[PDB]
Design a protein around this ligand. Structure first.
Ligand SMILES: O=c1ccn([C@H]2C[C@H](O)[C@@H](COP(=O)(O)NP(=O)(O)O)O2)c(=O)[nH]1
Ligand SMILES: O=c1ccn([C@H]2C[C@H](O)[C@@H](COP(=O)(O)NP(=O)(O)O)O2)c(=O)[nH]1
Ligand SMILES: [Mg+2]
Ligand SMILES: [Mg+2]
Ligand SMILES: [Mg+2]
Ligand SMILES: [Mg+2]
Ligand SMILES: [Mg+2]
Ligand SMILES: [Mg+2]
Lengths: 258, 258
């Protein structure tokens, strides 16, 4: 699916973004933090579907929002997977080393369907019962600190919903940087300006990116850079405040030296 | 704490409200529905706290909102506990009969604190790390269909936050009816009118209710009725669309006859 070399590079963008929020984020963040953050995005994702039997019956799933929620879970999962790697063996939580069947019960839709290879996520994800069981499962995987499994699920989820996971990751990665530049930590960012959520600008930024461009070993940097520029442009961001992919790769090599 | 007779009566209000949403709700709702609904309120509750390390740092917990989220979890827990009772023994999920330690791992704050008797919820709940571990636990209890335990936790939570759980239940119960009368199912309710969430009107409706009034065997009906009237009044609801407690108790006795 997505190549190991590209996955490495995504981890480096993630690391740089986390460093932008806190310079020694591995030292200050816990495994529980990333699990919580996945839990919170999983319910954001579920609220995209007409799951409520007492409100707004026959609403359509907001699949466009589901794309971004997936990518949000991705961010936090890459982060947890690399917090895990950086945790000393004697600080590894027992729930992540117990057998999987022993730390979760798997939810299953009532109706027949296909799933990912682990059988944790169910397709089509256009179906709300499939999504419910999928993300109730993802929350449990997050509780058992199974970040690498979650990453695999997301990737299978994006295959099924038929969008470019990596392209959207790059777009939202860029937006996350922008929020950090524009007062997200203090009370001052306007996330919904004129009634439009910042996330909803991202879709137009990934229209000309192919699945090939974004995963190709000789094409990807360039492809990522043109997505990043689109998002910075879409938010009228100064050139001096933009970073490109190599700036991220460079911050990554340098700043794994404590 | 809250008396068994009062608890019975709360279940009857719940049953009437559920019947208002769907007349044979025990037949159509599943145990998973109520667990999901608890999961979604638990994250609503957590978003009341400054848990994010990358956004709005040093925000205060919105404890006022936490009160209502607790009550929302209460609604759904009473509902699940009574779906459980109505489930034939041969349809009871295995995760609700397995030993508790076997279907969940308990999250614990880092710092020293007090807890409920089960050790699932941690005090003071003014502390965000206590709330996080508490409600990550509640989600797991919901997954194992432990609705009666959740009800016990909520009750201990409201003791700690120092508000009247039952008074707020009656207020929100009344609001839930109102939303059903005013187009919640179709696209047409305005939940946030002029920038104020409907839930935020409830606080002024419970100012003159004592802990005694609301739990007293000879005082409670009257006390509940005056809370209900306050909420209907606060939402300018026609007298003809209001119900009182005995109307709920009467719908309950009659409509446990299939
Ligand atoms: O240390 C962090 C903290 C946050 N995020 C990002 C990931 C995710 O894409 C975004 C979620 O931000 P939010 O405040 O939950 N807002 P929304 O869910 O609408 O994007 O925050 C990180 O990547 N690393
Ligand atoms: O069958 C149902 C469906 C909903 N609710 C109520 C309980 C809860 O108090 C409320 C939650 O409604 P919501 O749509 O999640 N909105 P909010 O969380 O802001 O109250 O819905 C019931 O009591 N029974
Ligand atoms: Mg979020
Ligand atoms: Mg969202
Ligand atoms: Mg999100
Ligand atoms: Mg809700
Ligand atoms: Mg809420
Ligand atoms: Mg709520």
């Amino acid at each position: 699916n997505i190549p190991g070399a590209i996955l490495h590079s995504l981890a480096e963008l993630q690391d740089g973004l986390n460093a932008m929020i806190d310079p020694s984020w591995r030292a200050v963040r816990s495994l529980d933090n990333w699990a919580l953050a996945i839990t919170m995005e999983s319910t954001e994702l579920l609220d995209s579907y007409p799951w409520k039997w007492w409100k707004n019956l026959n609403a359509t799933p907001d699949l466009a929002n589901v794309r971004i929620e997936l990518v949000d879970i991705f961010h936090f999962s890459l982060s947890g997977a690399m917090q895990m790697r950086s945790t000393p063996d004697d600080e590894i939580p027992a729930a992540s080393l117990k057998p999987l069947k022993e730390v979760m019960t798997t939810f299953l839709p009532a109706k027949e369907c296909t799933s990912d290879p682990y059988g944790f996520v169910f397709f089509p994800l256009t179906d709300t019962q499939n999504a419910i069981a999928s993300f109730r499962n993802i929350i449990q995987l997050a509780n058992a600190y199974r970040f690498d499994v979650i990453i695999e699920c997301i990737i299978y989820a994006a295959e099924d919903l038929g969008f470019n996971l990596v392209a959207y990751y790059i777009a939202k990665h860029t937006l996350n940087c922008i929020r950090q530049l524009s007062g997200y930590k203090d009370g001052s960012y306007v996330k919904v300006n004129n009634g439009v959520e910042d996330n909803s600008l991202l879709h137009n930024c990934i229209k000309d990116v192919s699945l090939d461009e974004v995963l190709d070993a000789d094409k990807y940097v360039q492809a990522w850079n043109s997505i990043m520029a689109n998002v910075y442009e879409a938010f009228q961001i100064k050139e001096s405040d933009r970073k490109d992919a190599e700036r991220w790769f460079a911050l990554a090599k340098e700043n794994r030296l404590a």
